[PDB]
Design a protein around this ligand. Structure first.
Ligand SMILES: O=c1ccn([C@H]2C[C@H](O)[C@@H](COP(=O)(O)NP(=O)(O)OP(=O)(O)O)O2)c(=O)[nH]1
Ligand SMILES: O=c1ccn([C@H]2C[C@H](O)[C@@H](COP(=O)(O)NP(=O)(O)OP(=O)(O)O)O2)c(=O)[nH]1
Ligand SMILES: [Mg+2]
Ligand SMILES: [Mg+2]
Ligand SMILES: [Mg+2]
Ligand SMILES: [Mg+2]
Lengths: 160, 164
């Protein structure tokens, strides 16, 4: 069952993020939104689907998951900063369950980056959507469990 | 060594890039365009204008210039792959000379990244424009000379990659 997300897991992740962000008095929503986008590209660079010049493209899994965990962190951070109640959690699991286009072949296509950019400059981009994106990448390319594991490791390192 | 770019310097850069890209039989325009965008973000990440949580934000200058050089390389690559004649060179220097918005305060504002993204998703984005962007960053935040220096170093290293 290593590739499903429960409401308890999501709430624990939000709490872990909140306790870290509590240490950062400059915490700023505009910056965290920019940070999400930059981390997304850092992650996309580890995937290397556009790097036709590599003999063996793709950085190591742990490196890919570490970068994916940085996206989650800002996604969780934006969620907490905006306020993320039960109704928001409900809508997240409904959006996740109803997402049919963010699958493996789509996410492996280097051109997906343009679609993502379009969503990233849209000022209506929601905190729910940002989380759906990162969790669907985890579900389809990795597992949710591996993302959560990598996130917990990274957050411990971030605390030091 | 003047923070200016001449037509001879630009033509040398294009020739350096062509000779490297000649070694890459999978050379692909869509991939190079994607690569330009990715390297732009790798470079923006070294600037750290959005990273309010850092005691001392901004990676070292050599790191920042190295990443800036990777953008130049794909910009030069896209130029050569599309064809870059005299008329293209003429129009580049006119665009560069006529660019008044891409200055230091604008480029230091984290929010510029959204403007850049909009330009990057536009399929009408030109090879000239991509070069204007990277050379204005060099001019305003660094010097053109430092970019060229960093690009030449990086291309030597890149030749050694394909060597082994
Ligand atoms: O407000 C914040 C800021 C940072 N962080 C954490 C999340 C993420 O794991 C990490 C990202 O911070 P940096 O971008 O500064 N370090 P990174 O490991 O990404 O290296 P680089 O900056 O070289 O890409 O810090 C937060 O959780 N909240
Ligand atoms: O067609 C090409 C391919 C690569 N290059 C050069 C430009 C740039 O300096 C470098 C980019 O390739 P990589 O992304 O593999 N090197 P980097 O260490 O920057 O990548 P990463 O940080 O993702 O490991 O190789 C070209 O000039 N033309
Ligand atoms: Mg980072
Ligand atoms: Mg990162
Ligand atoms: Mg790179
Ligand atoms: Mg690079």
């Amino acid at each position: 069952m290593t590739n499903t997300l429960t409401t308890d897991q999501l709430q624990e992740l939000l709490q872990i993020q909140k306790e870290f962000d509590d240490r950062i008095p400059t915490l700023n929503l505009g910056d965290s939104k920019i940070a999400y986008v930059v981390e997304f590209f850092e992650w996309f660079n580890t995937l290397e689907t556009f790097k036709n010049w590599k003999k063996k493209p793709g950085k190591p899994l742990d490196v890919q998951l570490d970068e994916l965990a940085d996206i989650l962190a800002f996604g969780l951070s934006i969620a907490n900063q905006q306020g993320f109640e039960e109704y928001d959690r409900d809508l997240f699991f409904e959006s996740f369950d109803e997402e049919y286009f963010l699958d493996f072949p789509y996410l492996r296509n280097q051109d997906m980056i343009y679609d993502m950019m379009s969503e990233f400059y849209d000022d209506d981009l929601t905190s729910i959507r940002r989380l759906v994106i990162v969790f669907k990448i985890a579900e389809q390319l990795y597992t949710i469990d591996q993302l959560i594991d990598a996130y917990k490791k990274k957050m411990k390192r971030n605390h030091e």
